[PDB]
Subunit: 380 residues, 4 copies
């Protein structure tokens, strides 16, 4: 019924055999056959299917209102499996602000296989219509984007993809299924770095994919079984466990996001602030119409790299590390860390400047997070 | 010094920090940075590197006498990462009876990416020389192959690859590093389904790759980080643990293999046996020159499908399941299981006859395994 | 600073060596020594100490404002270790409403070792003063109690224990350190079934003990090392992970508790309701003074066993199972399940009747939990 | 049939539900009930029973030819559960060189509970008969003992226990079920530190108990459920896995033991060797009659403390650490490590001399272990 209930009881995460209230961890590679080809419960080889992986796959399918879920060894592995739906000579359109690893995978791996890529400013969806070539087969969107939180109209993107015969993909990592459900808006495939919010505890690297399209699901299952980027059973289990608290965690994070943004907008050492909740933010109305909450990722400008480093050293509760969506609050400078692989001239033009700080708000106390960041900013 | 000692003390499998005699399980996604880019021990994000995965990578590098190891979420994922060393338009030669998953990855995924393939019978290495084009970049061989245990000259394949500028790859799953070391014989890259003997306990799906080539290692590390088919920390740990007993397990398996083959050759219900230890086996001398032991996979032909099925039902200690390299002895009928898509009128041409049985010998008592298979054969 | 921050950053739950932001899982039994008796990080044998166990021990010590923490294989193992502080001939006073397993351990195991036990109604603390014998060495209190939520004044109990030379113990399972901190009120030892709220995810059986008393800590460490009821490293890790979300979970649970109790008090099929938040509940003022929230365990009376069974079968979101403090809402009938080991005549006199239902409120949506239980009660 | 087969196929270590060839890891605390008291597969709460723990319990029962198995959080916890079979005033006889932790549990915990103890030299079983009182209820023996490998007649101890109405217990850690089966010789209860050989990989702390006596099993199950020193599911799984290779590991260890002893007896720097395989060892004939192999623990005397320390520093393949039964060969000096509390002037009386070295032989190559220890001895 309501989302917090669906998080606990949606999907298949109990044991039918013993009645155990959590998913057993099937640390196993193969399964006894009663007769040649007769599988007790449909399992024959864990790369093809594993019951704990099946559990987390059923969870992600349920939460995104899809029919089929797939668990991969990492988010980039989910992305690579989706890109392998295409052949040499196919073209894919992506939004122009994208995760550094997605940029690197597409431009340094898949272009070697003849897959053509254009990064387009999808914050106006008619840009997509101009960018469509006769060879375009896929439209791939992050919203909000990493790290500038650019917002793209999901429903309009889906309509464009349907009209032009494209596979539409949304990377829904930043919003989670708790706040934004691209499949409900006509998107073909939705995917996640489950490394971030879904796992939620900085202890699993994993990717998740969901679709309602039977033929896309069959093609993805074939790719996963043939290239083998599958999530292991222990990580699958820890993902199910982490997902249990996703709603509580996202709601704490959102409460903190609101206050932190107020502080940041008022602070003299802070210039521009990037977050879809700010009403002057481009496509703020689009975000409010396609999501009912916010990501915990915030970007904001300080003067320069050296102020950014001072800010990082003055905080007590923000941890300098990669990733986002942890219970711990994280801080980074994308131009020097996660987005160093994006060329510097494109970084400068897009606004990923040397003094752009990114924070992932965690689930610490709101007043502590605001006060800590504010006194650190006061140090400058 | 000797192999059984190297298995215990090779690689880095203790904790330098606490002194723990086993590798800690780093169930973690990210690592605190003391300053931007300043990593205490070189770790920043578990997809890029994870200390438990690094442990198992050091083990496989040591055991294969290489410099660099890589752990992937499956053997198929290791194979796919190695094939992604190539670009659209490059050509690769493989043995024609290569593992079905390798066949499917190449012909149903990578040919869509413009990679050209020739499948040749490599038991005569001039087959390889005939297939070489100006575009050939890679030579990929299993030895011995499945399920007929065809043997390929590793030293000559390496010489061919060196002379023509190819990256040579050996899938050494069936022999393990305990008996055959392709890198010592001039091969560029060696890889394993660690799902089989290396893990040894039918409880991990995993791939391992080793090389001594710094630039190949740099390229593989880039592919692994960008497409993300990495092995998780729990599975890496179980791999290190399983590998500890690899020599004891392989030696037990080999004693049973020898006695079982003696039984099979004497039995009236058996028309033919396939195993490289048999002196009339093709390239027996080649195998004895490049390996100092044997795989536990044996194939043998009985009268028909129904005799094969009877054999499965009459054994007490042979388990009907997919995979190989378990502690349990496993039994299968390739024409009904792994090769069912190949037609009956055509089966004879490839050698996958209706009465072809494959066993993966486990570590049960030799006398029990011999006696059990023998009395089952006596029921025919 | 504030509790939600302390939950994330309190205790030592990162890796000093690699910087990993979560506690490594030291699946290990022993530790290399650089010289005889020289321990790299103080570890020599995992039963004596294990770094992952040390992590969860530091967490529980921090959260209860103690100096020493101890992790046991179960709550009853924590309780048995604490009872083994006493000798044959010592006497212990417990409150008269206690967990069924605690009753069974004391009356069927430890009385065989000459430890004398009286269960006293501690809801008036002067009862304790009358019950003190010359041999009384320990005072052991649950508050609120299981399953009737009787409340005992912790501070007054501690004053009595100090004045009469008793070791005071509070079983703080139901309140968690998030709402009630017995050590701050003068109690010597605080303990938990970490199986319940602390782990929070129905996937760990564990006990935790905390004290500020150096000599009690030394005696407990000796008992734990000599009788060996230690928590394993994987369970220790899952406990740390679960504890991360304790504040969010308890706050959701408390929001639901308030509404569910309103519904239950208004419902015609429900007679008496047991929960410390109800202002007519005995020692409601005492509870509000020693805790700043509520447990999620509620007991209430329906007509009889058969109405209780009907109620259980009519709910959609309440799971019939043992334990409490899960993310899933649980329902039980204590007289038939957890408290069957308490004799029936004592059950009837104390109010643990055949129609007494116990619910553990989980973290599902409040409106769903209220509506589901209400329509189920309407079925009667 | 034969032992190596029984190790693989004995006990229940597959999943009946999915057919998984390994035991699922039930990381869970509680189980859904279809109706109050109606359990799908007999599970209601993981302290009482857990399916992964039940798997390892069935394994130890099978391997020791018993009916009932019990898994505890440590060997010391198994020992404590067995001792809690007694009441205040009961008397127990143990061999006088019993494991230090057993000595401490009995003399520093259980004597405070009114249990009376005699420590006697059991290498002559009439020692036992002399110590029997009317209050004697239990006889508890290790064979062979640590670190001098004293041998005790199991059959005669069982006859003594039967004649006088005692519960007989054998701590069979050093021999494992692979070589010695006390229950077959009339003993009531057999137990193990599974931390050592059974786990085999220095990565689990665990205890195991087996019996054929239904009423003893009922009493043990009650003690385990009420004091809660249960083994967790992850450790139970790692135990099942490690036990798979127990026979291969013990046989390798035994080959190395034989050759190493040949070396030690010939060496001028060695005054004396302690191991039951030596024909002049006390009760060598008794050991050969009750066991069909040997432990890997060997002790031998060199000149003094400084020669022992030199020996440790000169070895390449012997690791300085606590515990025994690793895949690594371990080396220790009992007078400086396990027996340091015993005074120097008194050391001689017990036989723990200053130059007494203990090694636990691992599964490294026999020639390496012999050569390494020999060249180290040559440095003296
Ligand atoms: C409510 C609920 C659903 C359905 O949720 P929708 O928002 O209607 O898709 C599915 N599963 C569970 C467990 C639920 O509680
Ligand atoms: C013997 C040994 C080696 C070297 O083995 P080679 O086959 O000679 O390369 C490496 N590491 C360890 C731990 C060894 O014992
Ligand atoms: C605030 C805080 C503490 C201290 O909490 P008290 O309530 O003063 O005992 C300890 N550790 C961390 C991480 C904190 O944030
Ligand atoms: C042989 C065998 C047994 C019986 O072993 P005994 O020593 O004769 O009791 C039991 N279980 C399995 C799986 C066996 O192979
Ligand atoms: Na469910
Ligand atoms: Na659709
Ligand atoms: Na090493
Ligand atoms: Na071709
Ligand atoms: Na040619
Ligand atoms: Na080379
Ligand atoms: Na911390
Ligand atoms: Na105090
Ligand atoms: Na079996
Ligand atoms: Na005595
Ligand atoms: Na006497
Ligand atoms: Na008996």
């Amino acid at each position: 019924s309501n989302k917090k209930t669906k998080l606990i009881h949606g999907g298949h995460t109990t044991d039918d055999y013993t009645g155990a209230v959590t998913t057993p961890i099937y640390q196993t590679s193969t399964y006894l056959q009663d007769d040649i080809g007769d599988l007790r419960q449909g399992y024959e080889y864990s790369r093809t299917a594993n019951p704990t992986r099946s559990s987390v796959e059923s969870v992600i399918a349920t939460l995104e209102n899809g029919k089929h879920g797939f668990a991969f060894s990492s988010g980039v592995a989910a992305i690579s499996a989706v890109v392998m739906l295409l052949d040499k000579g196919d073209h894919i359109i992506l939004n122009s602000d994208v995760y550094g690893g997605t940029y690197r995978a597409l431009t340094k791996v898949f272009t070697r296989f003849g897959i053509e890529v254009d990064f387009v400013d999808t914050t106006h969806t008619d840009s997509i219509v101009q960018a469509i070539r006769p060879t375009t087969k896929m439209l791939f969107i992050e919203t909000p984007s990493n790290p500038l939180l650019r917002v793209t109209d999901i429903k309009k993107s889906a309509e464009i993809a349907k009209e032009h015969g494209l596979i539409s993909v949304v990377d829904n990592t930043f919003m989670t299924p708790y706040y934004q459900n691209p499949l409900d808006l006509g998107i073909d495939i939705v995917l996640h770095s489950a490394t971030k919010y879904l796992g939620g505890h900085s202890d699993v690297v994993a990717g998740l994919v969901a679709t309602s399209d039977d033929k896309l699901a069959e093609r993805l299952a074939f790719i996963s079984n043939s290239t083998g980027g599958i999530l292991g059973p222990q990580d699958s289990y820890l993902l199910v466990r982490g997902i249990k608290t996703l709603g509580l965690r996202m709601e704490q994070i959102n409460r903190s996001v609101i206050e932190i943004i107020k502080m940041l907008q008022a602070h003299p050492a802070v210039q521009q602030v990037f977050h879809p909740s700010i009403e002057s933010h481009l496509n703020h109305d689009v975000h409010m119409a396609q999501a009912d909450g916010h990501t915990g990722v915030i970007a904001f400008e300080v003067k320069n790299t050296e102020s950014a480093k001072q800010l990082i050293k003055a905080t007590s509760y923000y941890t300098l590390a990669e990733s986002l969506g942890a219970v711990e609050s994280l801080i980074s400078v994308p131009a020097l860390m996660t987005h160093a692989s994006i060329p510097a001239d494109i970084r400068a033009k897009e606004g990923i400047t040397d003094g752009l700080v990114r924070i992932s708000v965690g689930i610490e106390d709101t007043e502590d997070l605001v006060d800590d960041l504010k006194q650190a900013l006061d140090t400058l």
